[PDB]
C-alpha cells in the first residue's frame, strides 16, 4: 500500500513531465528518468519518499 502508491504516482508524474516537453532538455530528462527508475527499483519507503519529492520539485519548478 505504501510502496504501490509511490510507484504509481511516480509513473504518472514522469508521464506528465514528458507531456510538458521535458525531452527537449536532455539534462532534465536524464535526471527525471534516473529518479523514476530508482523509485521503481526501490524497496523501502524511506528513499522512495525522498526521490519522489525530488522528482515532484521538478514539476513544481515549472
Amino acid at each position: 500500500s505504501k510502496m504501490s502508491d509511490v510507484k504509481c504516482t511516480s509513473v504518472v508524474l514522469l508521464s506528465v513531465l514528458q507531456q510538458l516537453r521535458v525531452e527537449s532538455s536532455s539534462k532534465l530528462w536524464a535526471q527525471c528518468v534516473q529518479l523514476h527508475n530508482d523509485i521503481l527499483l526501490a524497496k523501502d519507503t524511506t528513499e522512495a519518499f525522498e526521490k519522489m519529492v525530488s522528482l515532484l520539485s521538478v514539476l513544481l519548478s515549472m
Binding site: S1, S4, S15, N37
Partner: protein, 906 residues
C-alpha cells in the same frame, strides 16, 4: 646425499630434495592416453618419477626441476638410442642416462613444474572453486600478482574484462611452444623416427622429454602424429592471443606495428605462410578461401583456421569489395566481391559493367546494397562505443528516448478495493515500463563487445555436428517457389532504405512471382550485403535494460523465406520431438510435453538453464555450424556451389553486416540478429550442440579404470578413437552414441531455454553432464561465465520443471487423473493489467479482450496452495462483470469458460 650429487652430475646446480629422501614422489596431474584398455584426456597419478627442486646463487627456490624416472631396463637401452639420435635438436630437453642403487635412471634436467597438458586442462575444465593450478601458473609466470585473486569475480568475462589481458599475457609462451614443437617434428622427420606427440610430454618452455614409444625407421621417413595435440590445444590459442606478435615487424613485441596497405584485401599468401609456419605437419588440406572447399565439414575445418589467422590482418580489409560500373554512361559505386573473416574472398559471377537500364530487380539490389550509402556519407568517429564506425549518413546524430507507460487508475483502485497490494503481501508489483534516456540505444548496441573471436576444437566439433544432425532427421526440407510462401503480417517494416516508401506489403504487391524467383536465383550465384536497422523495444519488464531488436531488410527476409520456409514449417508441425516449437500449452499440451521428456529415464532428476547474453556472445563458428545444419536438407535441390553461396549470403546479411543506429553505420562484430527468419531454430541448434559437447567432455574426462561397466568403458574408448584417430564419419557409432544420449539424457528445447531429465547415478559417476560440466563448456566455447542464478535442480518428479518459458508447474487433479498445469507470475499478470502502453487502452468499457486474455493465463492459479495467489484470478472475473455492467455475455465471467481451456478434449 649420494643420490642427490649423482643427479647433480656435471650440471652444477644446488638441488634440494622434493619428496621423502630418495624415493618416488606422487603427484596428481593431467594426462592424454589412448591405450587399447583406457582412452581419454583426464587427471591421473604419477609415482614413477622423483623430483629435485633447484635453487640459485641466492638460494631461493626457482622454477627449474630435475626429474629422474625409473623403469624397465629395456626402456633405458631404447630411449638412450632414441635420445642419441635426437640429441642435436634444440627443442629436446637434456637427458643424463645413469644407474644408481643397479636400477637404470633417466634424468630430465631444467624442467618447469607444470606442462601444457596441465594448462590446457585447467582452462578447458574450469571450476570457480578448484582453480589452484591456474592461479599458481598465473602467479608463477608473472601474468598477475597474487593479490589479483582477492578481487571477487576476477574470472568473469563480463564483470571483469581485465581477465582478458591477464590471460593474454601467456600468448608469447604458447607461441614459443608452438615453434619448438614444429622444430621437434622436423627433427624427428629428418631422423626417421615415428611417434605420437601429446601435450603432457612437453614443458611450458616447449621442451620434449618422453621417448619410450618412438619406433625407429630409416632416415628421411619420419612421421609425427600431432592430431590430438593440435586439436586439444586449439581453443587456448585465441583465448591467450598467441598470434598477437605477428602484427609487428619481424614478429617482435618491442617493434612498431606493420603498416599494411589500405587497398590490400587478399592476404592469401599471408594465410598460407602462417599455416606453414605454425601447423606444418597438420595432415588435412587447408583452403584459405572456402569457395574451394568440398563439403560442409571441410568448410568448418578451414573456417576454424581462418578465424584465427584473421586477427593478424587490419580490420578495414573486411567487408564489401566495391567497384565502379556505368549505367548508360552514368557511373555508380556497387559492391562486387566480399571479404569474410571466416570464409576468405568471394567474387560474384554475374557482374555486368555496362547496364543500358536497370529494372525493378536491379533497382532493389542496388538500393539494398550499402556501397552508395557509405560512399556518399561523411566520416564518423564515435567514442561512445568501441565498434568500428563506418560513416554518417546524415549531418546530425539522432537520439532516441523511451517514454513511460500509462497507468490504469480504474483497475488499480478496483484491485485496492479487493484487498490486494496490502502491506506484507507476498503478491507485489515488480513489472513496470522503464523509461530510458537518449543514449540508451547506443549503450545497448555497445553490448556487442562481449563477442570475442573464439576458435573451436575442430576434431571434437566435427563429431558433435554429426551427432546433432541426428536430432533433425525426422523432418522434411527443401526449396519452395515464390507462390508457396506464407507471410503472416504484411504490414511490417521493410528495413532501410525501403521503410521510407512503404511497408512490406508494397514490395510483395509490386514484384511478381517471376521477379521473386529471379531474385532468388540471383542470390545463389552472387552476394548481396544489406543494411540492418536497430530499433528499440517498448515492453514491460522486471529490469531496466533498454532491449533493442534488429529489423532485417526485405531483400534478405524474402529470399530467406523462400529458402527455409518448408523446413521451419515442418519443425513447427512435428509433435513429440526434442524441439517443442509450435506445441501449444493449451488442452493438455503441457502434460504431453512433460511426459515426453520424462520418457523412461532410470534414476530421474530434473535440471535446466538459460544462456547469459545468448545473442551477443554466440561464436560465429557455432552460428555457421547451425546454418550448415539447417541447410543440410538441400541435398537434391541445390548443388555445392549454390549451397555455399546461400551460406555466404546468410553470413554477409545476418552475421557481420553494416548496422544503422541513428543515421550512422557501424559494423557488427558477430552474433545473431533477432530479426532473422530462422532465429529460434538456429538458437535451438546451438543449444543442442552445447549440450552434446558437455556430455562428450563429461564422458571423456573420466578415469576409464574406475568405470565398472564394460559396455560404458568400451563406449568411452571408441568415442575417443572415433573423435581423434578416425578422420571419416562412423555412422554405426554415431547411432550408438545418439541412442545412449536419448536413453540417459533426455531434452526439451525452445530457443535458448531447456529442461533435462537424466540418470542421477550416471551423473554421480561422471558418465553424463551436470551443471558443472556446462559452466566449463560455456567458459571455453562461449566466453561467458554461467553462475548458479541461471541454473536450477529438482530431485522430485511430482514438482515439475522449476522454470520453462517463464511458467512454473503444478500437479493438480482435473477430474479423476492428475495433470500438470503451467502457471505464470502473479506480479507479471498484475503489472500487465495495471500498466498499459497506449492511452486509449485505459478505457475499460472499450477493451474487454485484454482482460479476457489475461484471465485465460491467470486461471491456473485458482488451484495454488497459497490462497492469495488464487485470488488474482477472481479479481479479473469481478472486473469483467463491472465492464459489461457499465457497458450495458455471462460466459466471460463464468469459470467454466476458462476451465475448458486446459482440458484434453478440444
Amino acid at each position: 646425499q649420494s643420490f642427490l650429487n649423482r643427479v647433480c652430475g656435471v650440471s652444477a646446480a644446488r638441488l634440494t630434495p622434493c619428496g621423502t629422501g630418495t624415493s618416488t614422489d606422487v603427484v596428481y596431474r593431467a594426462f592424454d592416453i589412448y591405450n587399447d584398455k583406457v582412452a581419454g584426456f583426464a587427471k591421473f597419478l604419477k609415482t614413477n618419477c622423483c623430483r629435485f627442486q633447484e635453487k640459485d646463487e641466492d638460494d631461493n627456490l626457482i622454477d627449474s626441476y630435475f626429474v629422474v624416472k625409473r623403469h624397465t631396463f629395456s626402456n633405458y637401452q631404447h630411449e638412450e638410442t632414441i635420445y642419441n639420435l635426437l640429441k642435436d635438436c634444440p627443442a629436446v630437453a637434456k637427458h643424463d642416462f645413469f644407474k644408481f642403487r643397479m636400477v637404470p635412471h633417466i634424468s630430465r634436467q631444467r624442467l618447469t613444474k607444470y606442462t601444457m597438458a596441465d594448462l590446457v586442462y585447467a582452462l578447458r575444465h574450469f571450476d570457480e572453486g578448484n582453480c589452484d593450478t591456474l592461479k599458481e601458473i598465473l602467479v608463477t609466470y608473472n601474468c598477475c600478482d597474487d593479490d589479483y585473486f582477492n578481487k571477487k569475480d576476477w574470472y568473469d568475462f563480463v564483470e571483469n574484462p581485465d581477465i582478458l589481458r591477464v590471460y593474454a599475457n601467456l600468448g608469447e609462451r604458447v607461441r614459443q611452444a608452438l615453434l619448438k614443437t614444429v622444430q621437434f617434428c622436423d627433427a624427428m622427420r629428418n631422423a626417421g623416427i615415428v611417434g605420437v606427440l601429446t601435450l603432457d610430454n612437453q614443458d611450458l618452455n616447449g621442451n620434449w622429454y618422453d621417448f619410450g614409444d618412438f619406433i625407429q625407421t630409416t632416415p628421411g621417413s619420419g612421421v609425427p602424429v600431432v592430431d590430438s595435440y593440435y586439436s586439444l590445444l586449439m581453443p587456448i590459442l585465441t583465448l591467450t592471443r598467441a598470434l598477437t606478435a605477428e602484427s609487428h615487424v619481424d614478429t617482435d613485441l618491442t617493434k612498431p606495428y606493420i603498416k599494411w596497405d589500405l587497398l590490400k584485401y587478399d592476404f592469401t599468401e599471408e594465410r598460407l605462410k602462417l599455416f606453414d609456419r605454425y601447423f606444418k605437419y597438420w595432415d588435412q588440406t587447408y583452403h584459405p578461401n572456402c569457395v574451394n572447399c568440398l563439403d560442409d565439414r571441410c568448410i568448418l575445418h578451414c573456417a576454424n583456421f581462418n578465424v584465427l589467422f584473421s586477427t593478424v590482418f587490419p580490420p578495414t580489409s573486411f567487408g564489401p569489395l566495391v567497384r565502379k560500373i556505368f549505367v548508360d554512361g552514368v557511373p555508380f559505386v556497387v559492391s562486387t566481391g566480399y571479404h569474410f573473416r571466416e570464409l576468405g574472398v568471394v567474387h560474384n559471377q554475374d557482374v555486368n559493367l555496362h547496364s543500358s537500364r536497370l529494372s525493378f530487380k536491379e533497382l532493389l539490389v542496388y538500393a539494398a546494397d550499402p556501397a552508395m550509402h557509405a560512399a556518399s556519407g561523411n566520416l564518423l568517429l564515435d567514442k561512445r562505443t568501441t565498434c568500428f564506425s563506418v560513416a554518417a549518413l546524415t549531418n546530425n546524430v539522432a537520439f532516441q528516448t523511451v517514454k513511460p507507460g500509462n497507468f490504469n487508475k480504474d483497475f488499480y483502485d478496483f484491485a485496492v478495493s479487493k484487498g490486494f497490494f496490502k502491506e506484507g503481501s507476498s503478491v507485489e508489483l515488480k513489472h513496470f515500463f522503464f523509461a530510458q534516456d537518449g543514449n540508451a540505444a547506443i549503450s545497448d548496441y555497445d553490448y556487442y563487445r562481449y563477442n570475442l573471436p573464439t576458435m573451436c576444437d575442430i576434431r571434437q566439433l566435427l563429431f558433435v555436428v554429426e551427432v546433432v544432425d541426428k536430432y533433425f532427421d525426422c523432418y522434411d526440407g527443401g526449396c519452395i517457389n515464390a507462390n508457396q510462401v506464407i507471410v503472416n503480417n504484411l504490414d511490417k517494416s521493410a528495413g532501410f532504405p525501403f521503410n521510407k516508401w512503404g511497408k512490406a506489403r508494397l514490395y510483395y504487391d509490386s514484384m511478381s512471382y517471376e521477379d521473386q524467383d529471379a531474385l532468388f536465383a540471383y542470390t545463389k550465384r552472387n552476394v548481396i550485403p544489406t543494411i540492418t536497422q536497430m530499433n528499440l523495444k517498448y515492453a514491460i519488464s522486471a529490469k531496466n535494460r533498454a532491449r533493442t531488436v534488429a529489423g532485417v531488410s526485405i531483400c534478405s527476409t524474402m529470399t530467406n523465406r523462400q529458402f527455409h520456409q518448408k523446413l521451419l514449417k515442418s519443425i513447427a508441425a512435428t509433435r513429440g520431438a526434442t524441439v517443442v516449437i509450435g506445441t501449444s500449452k493449451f488442452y493438455g499440451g503441457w502434460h504431453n510435453m512433460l511426459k515426453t521428456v520424462y520418457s523412461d529415464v532410470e534414476n530421474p532428476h530434473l535440471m535446466g538453464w538459460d544462456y547469459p547474453k545468448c545473442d551477443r556472445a554466440m561464436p560465429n563458428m557455432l552460428r555457421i555450424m547451425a546454418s550448415l545444419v539447417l541447410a543440410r536438407k538441400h541435398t537434391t535441390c541445390c548443388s555445392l556451389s549454390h549451397r555455399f553461396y546461400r551460406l555466404a549470403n546468410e553470413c554477409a546479411q545476418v552475421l557481420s553486416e553494416m548496422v544503422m543506429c541513428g543515421g550512422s553505420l557501424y559494423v557488427k562484430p558477430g552474433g545473431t540478429s533477432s530479426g532473422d527468419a530462422t532465429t529460434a531454430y538456429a538458437n535451438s541448434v546451438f543449444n543442442i550442440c552445447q549440450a552434446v559437447t558437455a556430455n562428450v567432455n563429461a564422458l571423456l574426462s573420466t578415469d576409464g579404470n574406475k568405470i565398472a561397466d564394460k559396455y560404458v568403458r568400451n563406449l568411452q574408448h571408441r568415442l575417443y578413437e572415433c573423435l581423434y584417430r578416425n578422420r571419416d564419419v562412423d555412422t554405426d557409432f554415431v547411432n550408438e552414441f545418439y541412442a545412449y544420449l536419448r536413453k540417459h539424457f533426455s531434452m526439451m528445447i525452445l530457443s535458448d531455454d531447456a529442461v533435462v531429465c537424466f540418470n542421477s547415478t550416471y551423473a554421480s559417476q561422471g558418465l553424463v553432464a551436470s551443471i558443472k560440466n556446462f559452466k566449463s563448456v560455456l567458459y571455453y566455447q562461449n566466453n561467458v561465465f554461467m553462475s548458479e542464478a541461471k541454473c536450477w535442480t529438482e530431485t522430485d518428479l511430482t514438482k515439475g520443471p522449476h522454470e520453462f518459458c517463464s511458467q512454473h508447474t503444478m500437479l493438480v487433479k482435473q477430474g479423476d487423473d492428475y495433470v500438470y498445469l503451467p502457471y505464470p507470475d502473479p506480479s507479471r499478470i498484475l503489472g500487465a493489467g495495471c500498466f498499459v502502453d497506449d492511452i486509449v487502452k485505459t478505457d475499460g468499457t472499450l477493451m474487454i479482450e485484454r482482460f479476457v486474455s489475461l484471465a485465460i493465463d491467470a486461471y491456473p492459479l485458482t488451484k495454488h496452495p497459497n490462497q492469495e495467489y488464487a485470488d488474482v484470478f477472481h479479481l479479473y472475473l469481478q472486473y469483467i462483470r463491472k465492464l459489461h455492467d457499465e457497458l450495458t455475455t455471462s460466459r466471460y465471467w463464468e469459470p467454466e469458460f476458462y476451465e475448458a481451456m486446459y482440458t484434453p478434449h478440444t
